[PDB]
Amino acid sequence: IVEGQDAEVGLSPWQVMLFRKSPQELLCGASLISDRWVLTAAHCLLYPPWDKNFTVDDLLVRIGKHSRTRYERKVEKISMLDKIYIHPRYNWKENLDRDIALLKLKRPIELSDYIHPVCLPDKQTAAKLLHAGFKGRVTGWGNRRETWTTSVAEVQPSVLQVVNLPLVERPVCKASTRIRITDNMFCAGYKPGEGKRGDACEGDSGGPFVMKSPYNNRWYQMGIVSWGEGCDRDGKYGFYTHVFRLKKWIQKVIDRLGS
Amino acid sequence: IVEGQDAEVGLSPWQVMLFRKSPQELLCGASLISDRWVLTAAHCLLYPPWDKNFTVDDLLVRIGKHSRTRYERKVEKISMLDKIYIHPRYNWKENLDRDIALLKLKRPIELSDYIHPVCLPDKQTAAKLLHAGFKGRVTGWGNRRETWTTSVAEVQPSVLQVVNLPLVERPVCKASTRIRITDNMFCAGYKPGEGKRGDACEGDSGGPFVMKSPYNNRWYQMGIVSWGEGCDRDGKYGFYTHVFRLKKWIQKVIDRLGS
Amino acid sequence: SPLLETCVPDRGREYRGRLAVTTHGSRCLAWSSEQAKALSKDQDFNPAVPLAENFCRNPDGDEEGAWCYVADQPGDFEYCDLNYCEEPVDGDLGDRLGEDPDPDAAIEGRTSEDHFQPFFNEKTFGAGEADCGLRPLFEKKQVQDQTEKELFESYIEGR
Amino acid sequence: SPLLETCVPDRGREYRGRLAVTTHGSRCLAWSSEQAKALSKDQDFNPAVPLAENFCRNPDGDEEGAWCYVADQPGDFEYCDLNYCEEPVDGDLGDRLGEDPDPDAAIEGRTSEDHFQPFFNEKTFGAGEADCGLRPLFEKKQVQDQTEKELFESYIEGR
Numbered sequence A, B: 001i002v003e004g005q006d007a008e009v010g011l012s013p014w015q016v017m018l019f020r021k022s023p024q025e026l027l028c029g030a031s032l033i034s035d036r037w038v039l040t041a042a043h044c045l046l047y048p049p050w051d052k053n054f055t056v057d058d059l060l061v062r063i064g065k066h067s068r069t070r071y072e073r074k075v076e077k078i079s080m081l082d083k084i085y086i087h088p089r090y091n092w093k094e095n096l097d098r099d100i101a102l103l104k105l106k107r108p109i110e111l112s113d114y115i116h117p118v119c120l121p122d123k124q125t126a127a128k129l130l131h132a133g134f135k136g137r138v139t140g141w142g143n144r145r146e147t148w149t150t151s152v153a154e155v156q157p158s159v160l161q162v163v164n165l166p167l168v169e170r171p172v173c174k175a176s177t178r179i180r181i182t183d184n185m186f187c188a189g190y191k192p193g194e195g196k197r198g199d200a201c202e203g204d205s206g207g208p209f210v211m212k213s214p215y216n217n218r219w220y221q222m223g224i225v226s227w228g229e230g231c232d233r234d235g236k237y238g239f240y241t242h243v244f245r246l247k248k249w250i251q252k253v254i255d256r257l258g259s
Numbered sequence C, D: 001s002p003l004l005e006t007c008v009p010d011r012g013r014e015y016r017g018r019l020a021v022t023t024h025g026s027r028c029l030a031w032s033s034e035q036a037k038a039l040s041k042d043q044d045f046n047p048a049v050p051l052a053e054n055f056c057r058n059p060d061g062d063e064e065g066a067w068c069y070v071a072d073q074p075g076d077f078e079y080c081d082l083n084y085c086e087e088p089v090d091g092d093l094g095d096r097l098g099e100d101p102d103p104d105a106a107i108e109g110r111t112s113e114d115h116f117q118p119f120f121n122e123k124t125f126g127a128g129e130a131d132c133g134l135r136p137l138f139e140k141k142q143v144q145d146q147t148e149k150e151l152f153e154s155y156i157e158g159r
């Protein structure tokens, strides 16, 4: 997360860290949505043209943290995967249309003051809050700046990071790149006039773009960090996966699992 | 061809009706560059996504015609094929890049008043004429309007039709469509304010886009009718194969065909 | 081609043709097959026009157009160069509905709960829905977090 | 990937990496294979970097990246998703010049003829070129075309 500030210990308790076991390497992020299932950007697990295709034995998950490094002996909950569901039509050939996945913990993790599930929006609140101009939050340990002199080490946030980003008009959205923006995506980020900077850069994929509901004051996840051209680039607006639309799939998968 | 007049008997002797022998139907246009070779748009012969794969034994040529139907007993010249040379890197899978073919007639046709060749530009005149604002013509038996109510019969010109379109600034061209435009592609048409419509409609592909020189006043072939979105839509421009930039290839193909 | 079929409308939704080749220039798989019947086994298709053998179709009502399945793994499908009429729609953000989930049975009507309403069954989804969103050291502990305020000022507007 | 290999400049011109895949997610032919040896034989491959095995290379200076051959027929090639640096340059029309043809042999210089120049040998290209561009019923007959004039004031300009 570019131009964002550090996150407060305890802030986003659904902020999952998804990283491959050997070598130990931070891949993307994700959100805990219940005690046993996890949501993340599908491209984090599979991307054919770059030869990306991890399986369950390849990567573990880490819930309840702060620093993207330092075993937080008390608060964390390292746990293995089991399922890994990528969307049958996660258009990886052209424009990451449906960049949604859906991991499953091996054994239900236990909740805590640092480990708590976010909420999957419903049609109603999904109506009221999805309006150009309102803001949201995209969190993660993805790169601070968009480049480095030598070693990407020098551009990796120490603790978690957070940035409040605003939803743009689908029109200007379409207008930022020949990459076909789909019905189910949404670009967010400030305008060239607007003055403020901020954007979820590389490494951020999977991290959720959560929005607070004035009614019921609960936290909801509208999108997921999916794709973008560079970082904080005057002109380009970052894109996110429209989770509300894809929610019907999530249902179709989760309850089909046996019982 | 849209919003263009009927061509004078003999206005363009290099014009080439390219059609299939069975079932009998008009396919594309093209141009006579010598007494034995003819230059055409590649997507007339090959376009897999559609099932377009005509061999030599599939399509014949008609040099010297006028009305897109009526055996012109005294003037035309229906001959047989020999070559069909497509470009090795003809991008038919994405944006019809290098949409350029190279038909060779079975036996060298007899030149005439009504059948005369057109010239390929040279790096000098080339640099000179390709300026945004200058005009050129495009000839074709291709569709008048973009649609019909029933049967495209109700939109096919009786005789050869002509229109002069002005070259447009590549920068505007880009702006016209999401379809990636390449180095060797060039759009021509009038802008939204200008007040003069006109364009190569579907079925005009192959026909040449030609200008006349202000030195040596000979006629040169600057492009090849390739693609476009609709026909005569304000806000869009017709795209043509940049024959000049592909000139070196032609030289390789032809000049290595024997002695 | 001049003497080709007409201009395919409604973003190929009601398409009932026979093209079985992708833009990439690839083949196509039998709508009902060992491969394609597993990939379909999760989505939300719709009739309109049948899934005849292996011809490009737009069952899910996909607005970018009719497609074929090329292989078995996820994302292995591809669109068709059907020659559609007008450019696709640009639904202003929450302009395209996406009539979302039912309580595991289509059409609500008789819908009532306390003040939240789950949509995941509990048996499989697991635990925590009922009180999601409520961060422990904040919402439950009735303390605001540093920038929440800012997220808020956006909502109701400043102009 | 964050820790990934650095940026790819010059649109992949001097790129010597080892990715054997395409954006459509496919294989990649060996540059010196039967198939690939042919399709290239007639183009214009400048060096810049070696054609190493079947790795995505930009051997033609294609300014849209580097690519593979996926088969043998024309067009059966695909670009690679190399993750390039900056937005490709968009030359203003003739702005991408193109140093086209020699008198069949490299460089001109010692070049002088009447007023045209048959850049085509006559043998293989055939009859015509010499008197090309001149219409039997018009310029050769010093008679004007109905719109020739309109096409003319273009170069003169109305400003």
Ligand SMILES: *C[C@@](*)(O)[C@H](CCCNC(N)=[NH2+])NC(=O)[C@@H]1CCCN1C(=O)[C@H](N)Cc1ccccc1
Pocket: A028, A043, A044, A094, A095, A096, A179, A199, A200, A201, A202, A203, A204, A205, A206, A225, A226, A227, A228, A229, A230, A231, A232, A237, A238, A239, D001
């Ligand atoms: C995988 C995620 O960590 C990452 C998110 C960072 C993108 N930038 C911003 N500002 N959000 N996604 C990517 O980097 C994706 C993976 C595939 C390529 N990619 C891109 O954003 C490319 N730069 C653009 C693109 C390429 C192919 C298909 C869609 C988009």
Ligand SMILES: *C[C@@](*)(O)[C@H](CCCNC(N)=[NH2+])NC(=O)[C@@H]1CCCN1C(=O)[C@H](N)Cc1ccccc1
Pocket: B028, B041, B043, B044, B047, B094, B095, B096, B179, B199, B200, B201, B202, B203, B204, B205, B206, B225, B226, B227, B228, B229, B230, B231, B232, B237, B238, B239, C001
């Ligand atoms: C084959 C030619 O007759 C025809 C010319 C039409 C040009 N139209 C205008 N307004 N100047 N070519 C085509 O129709 C090309 C070949 C494939 C289909 N096509 C198109 O232009 C489509 N309408 C759009 C398109 C599809 C794929 C790649 C590029 C463009």
Ligand SMILES: *[C@@H]1O[C@H](CO)[C@@H](O[C@@H]2O[C@H](CO)[C@@H](O)[C@H](O)[C@H]2NC(C)=O)[C@H](O)[C@H]1NC(C)=O
Pocket: A048, A053, A055, C072, C073
């Ligand atoms: C990602 O890895 C898995 C291996 O676990 C691949 O799965 C196999 O894919 C082939 C080809 O589609 C199938 O025939 C096998 O039956 C699959 N095996 C299993 C256990 O699923 C998968 O194809 C890989 N994806 C890519 C793009 O390479």
Ligand SMILES: *[C@@H]1O[C@H](CO)[C@@H](O[C@@H]2O[C@H](CO)[C@@H](O)[C@H](O)[C@H]2NC(C)=O)[C@H](O)[C@H]1NC(C)=O
Pocket: B048, B053, B055, D072, D073
């Ligand atoms: C178009 O039809 C021709 C028929 O001649 C196909 O040519 C054959 O193509 C296969 C596969 O590439 C080759 O193995 C054969 O050697 C080719 N035969 C000849 C005589 O060329 C061609 O492939 C078809 N092209 C498409 C895109 O379908």
